[PDB]
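Ticket #4471: complex job returned nothing on first submit. Input attached below:
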Amino acid sequence: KTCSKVFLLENEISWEQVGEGIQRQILGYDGQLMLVKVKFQKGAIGNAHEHFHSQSTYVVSGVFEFHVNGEKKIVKAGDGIYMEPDVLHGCTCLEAGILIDTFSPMREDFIN
Amino acid sequence: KTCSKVFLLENEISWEQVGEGIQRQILGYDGQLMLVKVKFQKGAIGNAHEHFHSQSTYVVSGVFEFHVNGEKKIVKAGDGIYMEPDVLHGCTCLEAGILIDTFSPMREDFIN
Ligand SMILES: [Ca+2]
Ligand SMILES: [Ca+2]
Ligand SMILES: [Ca+2]
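Support reply: We reran it on our side without changes. The output follows.
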């Protein structure tokens, strides 16, 4: 049965170390939709990558420089970013904060 | 061509009035994934509803009482909620704050 629990409580879920200055919690998901909370320290880099999944991100807090398909924009709390299937994208955290990354379908690699 | 722009800047997107004390911005989406930012005043109610879409929500801020399939839980900033296809769910805002609701596939009704 491939899905998260119903209530994903931050203080009950393990933070996974993703890289230097980057930690994440996988929150609500099934095979078609996955929501990930990613906490960045200043200076941390989301390495450029491509994947077939659709991705839609929300900036909860902090300030980030994002690039999507070669285009750069600084985004801040309240802003969103859409990454169509297979587009190159990544980010650098300018001030510590949280992103919510969402995916369709799920990122099987994030649980396996 | 069914999708949002790449960079969804809060100060460039219209807030839509959804109901009493509830406003939303549709952020990054395509036909398979849609991310919605929903700002609630204290007291506001997300009416109980059912839909075939998968939904995964993140509590950005505030405090909410959620019900999913008849089960109630208070959630707060950092917590998530997963709503499998067709489950009855809704919420009441106990302290003003923001939810990110994500859907697969998109909520066609939110743009049409
Ligand atoms: Ca799908
Ligand atoms: Ca990505
Ligand atoms: Ca719903």
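The interface with chain B takes residues 3-11, 27-30, 32-35, 37, 54-58, 60, 66, 68-69, 71, 73, 75, 78-84, 100, 102-105 of chain A (CB under 8 Å). Closing as resolved unless it happens again.
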